[PDB]
Amino acid sequence: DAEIKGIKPKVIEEYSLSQGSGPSNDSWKSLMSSAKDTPLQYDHMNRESLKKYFNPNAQLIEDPLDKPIQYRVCEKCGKPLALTAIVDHLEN
Amino acid sequence: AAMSICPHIQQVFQNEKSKDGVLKTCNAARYILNHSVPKEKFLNTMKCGTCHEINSGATFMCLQCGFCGCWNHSHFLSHSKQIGHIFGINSNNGLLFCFKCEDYIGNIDLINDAILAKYWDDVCTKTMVPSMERRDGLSGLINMGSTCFMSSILQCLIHNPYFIRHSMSQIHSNNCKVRSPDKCFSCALDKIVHELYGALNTTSTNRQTGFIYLLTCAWKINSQQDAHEFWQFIINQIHQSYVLDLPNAKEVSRANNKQCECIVHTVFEGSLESSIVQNNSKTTIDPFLDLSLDIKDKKKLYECLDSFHKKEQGECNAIKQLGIHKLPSVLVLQLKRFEHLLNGSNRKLDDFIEFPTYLNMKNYCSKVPDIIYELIGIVSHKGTVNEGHYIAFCKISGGQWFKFNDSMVSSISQEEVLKEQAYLLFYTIRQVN
Amino acid sequence: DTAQLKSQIQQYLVESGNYELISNELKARLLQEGWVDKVKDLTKSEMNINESTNFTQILSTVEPKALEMVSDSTRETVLKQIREFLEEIVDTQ
Amino acid sequence: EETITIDSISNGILNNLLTTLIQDIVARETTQQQLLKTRYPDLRSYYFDPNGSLDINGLQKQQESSQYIHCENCGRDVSANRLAAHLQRCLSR
Ligand SMILES: [Zn+2]
Ligand SMILES: [Zn+2]
Ligand SMILES: [Zn+2]
Ligand SMILES: [Zn+2]
Ligand SMILES: [Zn+2]
Ligand SMILES: [Zn+2]
Ligand SMILES: [Zn+2]
């Protein structure tokens, strides 16, 4: 089939594609400020579709069966505790 | 003591300041992955600093510096040696990789539970990992006299990720005003979870105490033996208990017209749009907690939904249509199988209806994107409308399915599960495009 | 000019919003056709077979097999879509 | 060198998408099993019976007819398969 000459110059310009072939000086740590600003995101549950087709107050667990129920068991009373519940349970 | 721990993270973990720094960075990376919009996430956590490709295999976020390096061209490996940074986090899943071991560090609870780093010493001393036998919550409920219509439902509730999170989070226990499992349903259900996933104490029956408490609760509030009816009964009790534990139920109600923050109404509820006939003349929105479908002369669940969604039958048109206005996080379907005729006789419909492991709801919402649910629960009925038996089938992590036949819990192939005559189906939301 | 053609195109796909669509579409299909759960099984099976949970080792027996399990229909559909997007921004000789 | 085309770039894009997703799934699998195995060195799989007679511990259905539960409301041993009917009559008290 057809060999590629290059990407359309017009497209190169629109998207500022011309880059430096050398290593990036980017840092993933620089993202923290934007991350803190930004509401919880899902890998594959589109935020706008969620607003449209689901309830605003819906509970959402992404890939619930991804792995087992992550919990620990209180050695005092034996209750199974969600990670985010352990500290408060240890205080009551 | 066959399987070992990465000696490298262990070494670095001998210094406290180093331990806290690694955990802070892990939490940090994970936090960013959960609060980055798609484009940012691709361009900033899945873009290799060396070859600048997106998704050149997993891309790793380095612990010690800002670099991201890809797998497929070995560009993080190159980074680990030339700079001495051997720990990277996969930006698709937050797992920590060691490039000396060339393996993930997956068996250190502190790392797995990093969110608790600041409290780890308390956590470790006062709580223990689940026991091998209870880790998956698997345990049968004895049939105590035509109570499989209850036990089948409970099994599905107990293996529903949302309800399980809700119970283990202590939400209800922390606000309940009765505090008695022999009187409060929600307390009774909490106790079952406790028995099945933890340890309740310090023949031949075991782990039936919660279920017995629930029967006792049931009796205090007060036949047909319809599992669907008990589903509705129990989800209602959870809601009523939520409302009972509020300091201000009255005013919250008129606050936001008939809207509820309870586990039931934030997980299981959706709404149907009933439309009259190119605009729609009129529209009524009505909540549902499940969809009851007709199965007569149909062979597949999609055909049932298609039927339910059909146009039937003025200013600019008139035609009637039922569609979904809002979907729930967990979609529960009843396939109507019990006919109750006018002469007082009852007729059971044993028609097999094919149902898929993944259900796409896009065609039934009033272009709609793929909205894909995962089948995680089946309740099946065998026999007559009143003298029948219910069995539950549940899917847990890893894809294994389990059949709950009263006290017998057995494993079953997905292929065989799919051959079941489904009565209720539980689907959990998995992907929304 | 060089081997930056690929990265440059991906940068366009991402910025334009089309990489999301392709990624989501591919995932939707692979999930629906049973492939995701196939690969999980295959991985579990390979762990037992090799008596190992070492990622690198396990990946090397799963990946080739996993790539091959993609249905013709998904492969050629998402290829076609990726192709159409590029048809729009590359020149040919 | 091969002559790079829209097809080759496209396969390359699909392969990146495909390999990343496989490598994600496998990582989740290998970390989970490594955890289970370190956590429980005597870990045993759940029993599976093609005959469909044995439970996840390899045991036969226990006979519920011959089991009993001690009722706290009246202090009697009650046949398990009768606990529901008994409760209705006992809780009346
Ligand atoms: Zn406790
Ligand atoms: Zn290591
Ligand atoms: Zn690279
Ligand atoms: Zn580094
Ligand atoms: Zn309560
Ligand atoms: Zn409610
Ligand atoms: Zn009694």
Q: How would you describe this structure in keywords?
A:
heterotetramer, A: 92 residues, alpha+beta, two-stranded antiparallel ribbon, 4 helices, 3 strands, 12% strand, D: 93 residues, mainly alpha, Helix Hairpins, Double Stranded RNA Binding Domain, 2 domains, 2 helices, elongated, binds zinc ion
Describe this structure in words.
- The complex is a heterotetramer of chains A (92), B (433), C (93) and D (93).
- Chain A has helices spanning 9-14, 32-37, 47-53, 86-91, and strands spanning 4-7, 71-74, 80-82.
- By secondary structure, chain A is of the alpha+beta class.
- Chain A has one domain (1-92).
- A two-stranded antiparallel ribbon of chain A has the order 2-3.
- Chain B has two domains: 1-128, 2-Layer Sandwich (Herpes Virus-1), CATH 3.30.40; 131-433, Cathepsin B, Chain A, CATH 3.90.70.
- In chain B, strand 10 and strand 11 form a beta hairpin.
- Chain B has 16 helices and 20 strands.
- Chain B is an alpha+beta fold.
- By secondary structure, chain D is mostly helical.
- Chain D has two helices and two strands.
- Chain D is elongated.
- The termini of chain D are far apart.
- The C-D interface holds C 5-6, 9-10, 13, 22-23, 26-27, 30, 36, 39-40, 43-44, 47, 53-55, 58-59, 62-63, 66-67, 70, 75, 78-79, 82-83, 86-87, 90, 92 and D 4-7, 9-19, 21-23, 25-27, 29-31, 33-34, 37.
- Bound molecules: zinc ion (ZN) (7 copies).
- The site of one zinc ion (ZN) has 8 residues of chain B, from loops.
- Chain D: Zn(2+) binds at residues 71, 74, 86, 90.
- Chain D: This is SAGA complex subunit SGF11.
